[PDB]
Structures are given as structure tokens and as C-alpha cells.
Amino acid sequence: TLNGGITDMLTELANFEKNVSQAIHKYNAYRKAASVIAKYPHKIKSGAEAKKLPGVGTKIAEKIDEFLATGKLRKLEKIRQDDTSSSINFLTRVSGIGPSAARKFVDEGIKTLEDLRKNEDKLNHHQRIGLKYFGDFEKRIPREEMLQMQDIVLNEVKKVDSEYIATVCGSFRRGAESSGDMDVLLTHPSFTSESTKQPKLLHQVVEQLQKVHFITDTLSKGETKFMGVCQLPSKNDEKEYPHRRIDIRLIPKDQYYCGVLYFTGSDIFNKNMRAHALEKGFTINEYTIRPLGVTGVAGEPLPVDSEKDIFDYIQWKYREPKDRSE
DNA sequence: CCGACGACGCATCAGC
DNA sequence: GCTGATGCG
DNA sequence: GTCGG
Ligand SMILES: Nc1ccn([C@H]2C[C@H](O)[C@@H](COP(=O)(O)OP(=O)(O)OP(=O)(O)O)O2)c(=O)n1
Ligand SMILES: [Cl-]
Ligand SMILES: [Cl-]
Ligand SMILES: [Cl-]
Ligand SMILES: [Mg+2]
Ligand SMILES: [Mg+2]
Ligand code: NA
Ligand code: NA
DSSP: OTTHHHHHHHHHHHHHIIIIIOOHHHHHHHHHHHHHHHTOOSOOOOHHHHHTSTTOOHHHHHHHHHHHHHSSOHHHHHHHHOHHHHHHHHHTTSTTOOHHHHHHHHHTTOOSHHHHHHTGGGSOHHHHHHHHTHHHHTSOEEHHHHHHHHHHHHHHHHHHOTTOEEEEOHHHHTTOSEESSEEEEEEOTTBOSSOBOSSOHHHHHHHHHHHTTOEEEEEEEOSSEEEEEEOOOOOTTOOOOOOEEEEEEEOOGGGHHHHHHHHHOOHHHHHHHHHHHHHHTEEEOSSOEEEBOTTSOBOSOOOOSSHHHHHHHTTOOOOOGGGOOO
């Protein structure tokens, strides 16, 4: 990767601001600069060259100059030395521990993996599962395994009701050679924006995937969103596969294209696109694109029959999923 | 200078 | 119990 | 932290 040293430094700065400083706009600003530098097709030679890119300003250009000249950033060398920041940064790597809980735990003297294991009684359900699979959740998923997982989910949903449609989204749909988790978009004709003609539509799918021992744990579960844990079956005498994170989102069937646009991401791509929509006078969520009125209040949903229709409303050329990895 | 920075589901808690 | 705010994702 | 107006 052409500018990997720079984008790694900006990512570490972003994480510092989110986890330690609890400065979410600085977190998003460093992420935006790292994203625009990541796609820049030249090896950056100066901070001035980088400042030409949108989202890189004076402060980050100065940090890039320091990094290019020395290979390091003093500000980060200090943060890495700092016990409190280091402990907080670590604890947020556990799923369900965010910046607030991480600082609370560090305040109570809970600062290592050992400390967490000893104090399991102070964790909520999600954090408990995140700790149990801390090691597994740090591993990437090879695309070959993503394909096996897709084949299980799609076949088990079909067994519940052949009218379900399950689509694997996220980085998988963008063509990534490895993924951090599996994201599944689910639809069923009995659930539309107009009516819900069947209860338990997500529940029945979750139950079936549990019955065949694919889903192993639940982090959170409502009528439309499931967050949990899953695992591929292994063969005789084979080492078990790592446990993996799985997210399932049931979307109204008539709102599939807004839903698949949202669930394909990337998250930075959606933020860029939704910000552009606002500049163009629309608001986009996972259900609808609506116009903004003279006062800025959302109007009625606009008709959408393809992902491209949403790009057309905001005057963007269509971008295939593989070109949305921002 | 200075306001705005994407949009939302589920879990948890405070206050009533 | 319900409603609203906050955390986390 | 950055940017548009
Ligand atoms: N704050 C966020 C977080 C995520 N998503 C989205 C964009 C996605 O593509 C997606 C699926 O979520 P993931 O967190 O699982 O991210 P990815 O699938 O894109 O990458 P990976 O899971 O490989 O890390 O959620 C979004 O719009 N806003
Ligand atoms: Cl901030
Ligand atoms: Cl460094
Ligand atoms: Cl809506
Ligand atoms: Mg994903
Ligand atoms: Mg996910
Ligand atoms: Na710039
Ligand atoms: Na976390």
C-alpha cells in the first residue's frame, strides 16, 4: 500500500480521539483524511502535496511532514507511552466496551485481559460475549470461508420459508478477499413499509440457525436487527474454525435497494454519500431517500427501483460495490 | 469566523 | 410500566 | 480537524 505509513498514523490518531479524548468529530476527521490518502494513487512526498486533498488540512499536513522526515510522530510516541490512554485503547477492543465503559473500568483498576476475566461479574451480556471471543473476533475471515458461511445461511433461511431472500452485504459484497464479519440483509414479502402480516420473521430465522448450531451466541436481538456469533462446522479431527461476528438486518421488502445500499457500505462511503445528498437537498437512510423541504424537514419517500436510482437523485455516477471501499 | 459534521436499532438507566 | 437520554454498534 | 459560505 503506497501510503500505508501515513494512513496507519492517521488511523491511530483517529482511535486516540474516539477512545481516549471522546472527541467523535476529530475521530471522523482523521478517518476521512486516512480514507482520501488511501485512494490517492501516488506516493506522497510532502505535507503540502497531501493538503491538496479534501479532508487533509494544516494540522495533518504538518504531521505528514514530521512522519516523512523521521518515520515517526512524537505525539503518537507519547500516547503509546501513556498508561491511561494505552489501557483505555486496549479495553475498547472488546466488543461492547466503548470509550465510556473503558474509562470507567480503568478508573476501577480494570486494565488488562486478566482483569476483565477476573471481573466478569461487572460486564453486561454483550461485553461478556465480546470477552469470551476476544481472540477470535480479532481474526479476519478469508473469502473462501465467507462463501461457506453464505451457503449455510442462504440454505437455512430457504428451509424456514422459501419466500425469504438473504443477501450477504458489507465488505463481502464489495469483493474483499477477507472480511471482519458477516452482514446479512433479510427480506420477506409479509414485511413491507405498509404492513407486517407475520410476526417473528427475524426470530424464526435466528432460531433455525441456532438449531443447526451455526449461531452460537446473541449480542442483541430485536424485531429487525440481530447481532450475534456464528461458527462454521469442522470435519473429523479438524481444529475448530474461529467464532465469527454476524449481523442480520430485516428490511421492509419494498425498501430493499435503500437497504442494500446502506448495508453494502463502506461506512465512510455512506457518510460521504449521505453528506453529499444533504448538500443536494435529500436525506438518505436505510429505508428511503426523501427530499428536504424549504425548512429542511424531510418530505415523502421518493420512488426507488435500483441502487442506481439513489445515485441518480443526488447526481453521482453509479459506483459498483467494489468501488465503494472508502 | 463558526456551525455542521449520516442515520438508526437495541440495551441500559434515570425519572416519573 | 412508559418515555427520553446515553452508550455502543 | 476540516471546510464552505
Ligand atoms: N457507523 C456505521 C457502521 C457501519 N455501517 C455500515 C457500512 C457497511 O458496509 C456495513 C456493514 O457493517 P460492518 O461494520 O460490518 O463493516 P464492513 O462490512 O464494511 O467491513 P468489515 O466487516 O470487513 O470490517 O455497516 C454504516 O453505514 N455506518
Ligand atoms: Cl470532537
Ligand atoms: Cl509513530
Ligand atoms: Cl424513513
Ligand atoms: Mg462487515
Ligand atoms: Mg457487521
Ligand atoms: Na485539503
Ligand atoms: Na469495543
